Write a protein that binds this ligand. Structure first.
Ligand SMILES: CCCCCCCCO[C@@H]1O[C@H](CO)[C@@H](O)[C@H](O)[C@H]1O
Ligand SMILES: [Zn+2]
Length: 256
């Protein structure tokens, strides 16, 4: 088995699918987690980016991407899976064609810009598929509607469809604790029946320990009960006990 996980940001795959990644590695699968929006960023930073850097426990003008890449490597090494850091800039570092920052909340902009980004991400994913030759791709459902998650999900769907590789979407955590869960896929795609995994306690522990490697995100993610909320979420999906993660297969719609 060759499992390619496609994470929007540096932490999403571990937060949402860390137990599944860890189990896959345990079972002897070759597992690679490619993070789309891991692109190097340098000052000048927007005021919004400077504020986020502060929330992440960094100086406003620090190399936040460098810090997060190192966190990601530690977390993924802890799960014993490989990493690959993509070239795309996180939403807080992107500019619009007219020179404005993308984020301020997202500034009004042309769908053309969204399409162009999705196209480039899709190009990179098609190349990674050629290079890694995955038997399964898993990426985010984009529950919560973060534009980077939506771009990642849509690009992965288009790339996998063209390359004829099976794809599944994970339930975005911790977002799904606060959202309804319904998502709007690009035309022609739909979700099949959910799978709710049940993993051994060791895999829960491995996942939670890996999450902790993302120290910069802990204040943001905890709001001080992140792990309790993750446990409660799994409990609600599997009342008989045991930790797990929800994923859906993505298939072609009828008449498409
Ligand atoms: C960014 C668009 C507005 C909606 C707010 C959603 C909550 C923010 O979410 C975050 O945003 C960042 C910047 O993209 C990231 O670097 C993070 O990993 C992430 O958790
Ligand atoms: Zn994210």
């Amino acid at each position: 088995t060759r499992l390619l996980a496609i994470s929007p940001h540096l932490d999403d795959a571990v937060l949402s699918f860390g137990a599944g990644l860890a189990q896959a590695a345990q079972d002897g699968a070759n597992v690679l987690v490619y993070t789309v929006f891991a692109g190097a960023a340098q000052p000048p930073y927007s005021p919004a980016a400077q504020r986020m850097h502060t929330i992440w426990g960094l100086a406003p003008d620090d190399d936040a991407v460098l810090y997060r890449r190192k966190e990601d490597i530690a977390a993924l090494d802890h799960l014993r899976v490989a990493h690959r850091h993509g070239r795309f800039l996180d939403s807080i570092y992107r500019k619009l064609p007219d020179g404005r920052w993308l984020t301020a909340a997202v500034n009004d902009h042309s769908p053309d810009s969204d399409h162009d980004l999705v196209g480039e991400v899709a190009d990179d994913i098609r190349s990674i598929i050629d290079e890694f030759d995955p038997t399964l791709v898993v990426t985010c459902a984009a529950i919560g509607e973060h534009p980077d998650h939506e771009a990642t999900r849509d690009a992965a769907l288009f790339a996998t469809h063209e390359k004829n590789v099976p794809v599944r979407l994970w339930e975005d955590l911790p977002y799904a604790v606060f959202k309804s869960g319904a998502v709007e896929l690009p035309q022609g795609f739909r979700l099949g029946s959910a799978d709710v995994s049940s993993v051994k306690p060791e895999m829960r522990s491995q996942k939670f320990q890996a999450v902790e490697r993302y120290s910069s995100q802990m204040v943001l993610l905890n709001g001080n009960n992140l792990f309790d909320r993750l446990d409660e979420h799994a409990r609600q999906n599997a009342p008989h006990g045991g930790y797990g993660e929800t994923t859906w297969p993505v298939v072609r719609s009828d008449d498409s």
